[PDB]
Amino acid sequence: QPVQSPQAVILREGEDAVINCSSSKALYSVHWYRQKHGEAPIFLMILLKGGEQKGHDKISASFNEKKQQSSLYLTASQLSYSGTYFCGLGDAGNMLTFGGGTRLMVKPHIQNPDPAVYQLRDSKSSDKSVCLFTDFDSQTNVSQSKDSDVYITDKCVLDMRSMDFKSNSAVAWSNKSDFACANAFNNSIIPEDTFFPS
Amino acid sequence: GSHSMRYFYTSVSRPGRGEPRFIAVGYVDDTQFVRFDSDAASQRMEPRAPWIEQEGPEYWDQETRNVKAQSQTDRVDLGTLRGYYNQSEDGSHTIQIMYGCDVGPDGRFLRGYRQDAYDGKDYIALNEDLRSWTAADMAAQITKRKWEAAHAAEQQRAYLEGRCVEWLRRYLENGKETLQRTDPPKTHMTHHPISDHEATLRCWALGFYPAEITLTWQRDGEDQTQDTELVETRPAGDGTFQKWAAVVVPSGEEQRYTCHVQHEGLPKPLTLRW
Amino acid sequence: AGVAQSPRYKIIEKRQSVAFWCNPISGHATLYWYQQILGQGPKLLIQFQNNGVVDDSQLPKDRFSAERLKGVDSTLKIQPAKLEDSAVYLCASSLGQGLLYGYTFGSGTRLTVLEDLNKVFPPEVAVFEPSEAEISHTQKATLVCLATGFYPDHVELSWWVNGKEVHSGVCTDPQPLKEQPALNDSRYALSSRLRVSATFWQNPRNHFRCQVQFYGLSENDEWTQDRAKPVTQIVSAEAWGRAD
Amino acid sequence: GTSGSPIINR
Amino acid sequence: IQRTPKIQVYSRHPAENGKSNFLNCYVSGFHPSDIEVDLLKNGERIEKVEHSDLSFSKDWSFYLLYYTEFTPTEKDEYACRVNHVTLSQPKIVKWDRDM
């Protein structure tokens, strides 16, 4: 029965966002959980009348009796802030009825990008080669496959902790002989500063 | 005048006859309004007053849960407590909870309650501050420490100061006609000669709400305690109450005696002669 | 300690039977069973207060059963299962009721109910050596891998450098790709990338193993197909460092 | 309206 | 501890011969809760007897109300039969119209 304001939000790390929880019937206790990947929702905050405004790490939440609403404030995102956030509603006996959920993706700030499309070796077990689109900006979006015999996996954030270097990357492959680089990411918007080696 | 909402929980163990019995009763002053029987076929909280029937299915669903959660706690606690007292395997035991609040004629909050008793005598009790507990003994002390680590008092005060009064206020308005009323006693007096020199004079009071009444026998205005028999205020069964006070007096001395009646529904305290 | 939930993953055929076991936090009086279809808000099934049931209103009693006999651990049963049941079965625990107490959830059991068990396939792991073009234009070398033709999505990818599972300079796709997007019972594909310094990949005294954990069918399941029973297994693909 | 919180063991 | 029940036999409205009334048996101040309460017309059990729901007094002692629809007469005799663990044989209380 509770109503969650943004169903999905894609922020750029360092930005702030507010998740809103609404209720038709008077409040008791409001719970907030964060569920990452294919894992258990971890508990963040529980708010009652006794209070109202509270916190967990650098996330703070507010409870309003007269408005019959609760909001979750996320300020200066950490990229570890992904993904889903749920609000729970308290019964007289505290029995949770979950809201829709907020699928929050935090995209990072790649300082010095150099978009490039490479071809990876192998030649064993699995047929053909694989093409990787890398070091592109979080502003550019990876468009999925137009073709049915060619596969394109959406961009994902990698993080080499030893260098404090973060990078985006998309992977494409096919069984076809016709398949090659540059033509691989045609459906997608390749940036100007782009390198296709030979 | 003043008003109160009281909930009474009785859990009685019964070995051989399976899991214990749980009875839950709800009260607004001297009017029962709700009930739960863990032996009943319904397995739901049921109405016992006309104005509570109004309440929605969401109300009745909630009440069922709260009362079922408590009975299931009681079944475990019945075992735990028997252990706490190092008690014998054989026998039936009782756990009694009483809770609720008091309001003014204005509707303003006055007092919250939570009291627990094992086998007819006190176990654990929430103090007037609704911040601390009172352990009757050492077994009760274990619960006390367990419940301080569980912030029970904190959560109890929230209900009693908050929702208890909000609910009391709601019921008092909804059932205005039966609750916010005071019907005075229907007094009469009887003579019973128990001797040729002595007689039993009975002062009666029938059909009055609420239960708080005061019947006193006065010989020349001077109140009597001697030979003054007083019956416990009994319920009529229709929602009103009954009470009598009698005194044995010497024959011919009937004029010296008066019965002083005090009730909320009375404009002035009554004084009756033979 | 934490709330324990067994098994992690489960595969069941259209009308078969399954039980999900759960152990709550020690001494917790309240136990909950929630069902989470896809990623959506978890939906309540049953609530417990020790040995007994507080609320089973949202239980599809036509098949679903739940028992917590000694008021400790609980077992949720579906008899018979339906294709509509495939979801994550979550179990949480509260000290009691509870207005100040937040729930403590277990990792949940992912159930996948299928048409025919014949639809189940294990993955095919393959590693692709870092492109020389990259090791020249950049100071880094990124390995790519592919787990292909697996059904259902009961997989877990892991990168292993010289026997140590690595997490820094690693990225696996959050969602798998359907090889035939047309079918709902379509086999999936999944890629993961590991990025190291060019100097690291350039050392042949370095080993890189890409591991995929499939959670297939058990030794108790009856299998008549031409290929071998796709049981719970670790399919792997490995590569060694190269100077050239 | 009956108490829903706390309902904890003794 | 064990507490003996205080019994009270009376009618809802003042007793009027041939007029419809309600007989009541008020059992109170007892412990434990398990009590056997019987209502008898001419030394025999009255079949349709309805009771109230169990409740206790401030001292934690129980109280119960047993009641039946009845039309009293001069000849007919009524009584309440109560048995508790605190009593060897049941206590029979003959109903007095004047009380």
Side-chain angles (χ1 to χ4, degrees), chain B residues 224-262:
Chain B
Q224 308 303 315
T225 313
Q226 281 198 300
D227 302 82
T228 317
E229 172 102 2
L230 242 100
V231 284
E232 183 197 305
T233 310
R234 58 197 197 187
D238 77 284
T240 64
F241 291 87
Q242 291 175 6
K243 197 192 199 73
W244 65 249
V247 62
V248 66
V249 303
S251 284
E253 227 189 278
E254 294 92 11
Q255 322 84 57
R256 301 227 290 187
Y257 291 84
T258 25
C259 184
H260 297 241
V261 187
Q262 278 106 6

Side-chain angles (χ1 to χ4, degrees), chain A residues 128-176:
Chain A
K128 205 67 199 73
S129 173
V130 167
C131 299
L132 161 110
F133 176 36
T134 192
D135 298 322
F136 54 97
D137 200 286
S138 304
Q139 264 80 265
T140 59
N141 269 257
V142 176
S143 312
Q144 41 78 65
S145 198
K146 192 165 83 187
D147 201 326
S148 62
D149 49 65
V150 179
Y151 313 102
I152 288 97
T153 54
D154 222 283
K155 61 170 182 179
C156 89
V157 196
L158 182 137
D159 182 31
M160 287 172 85
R161 259 180 65 250
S162 164
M163 293 176 161
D164 314 320
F165 168 72
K166 298 171 178 184
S167 65
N168 281 292
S169 60
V171 177
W173 71 98
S174 189
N175 71 298
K176 277 200 157 67

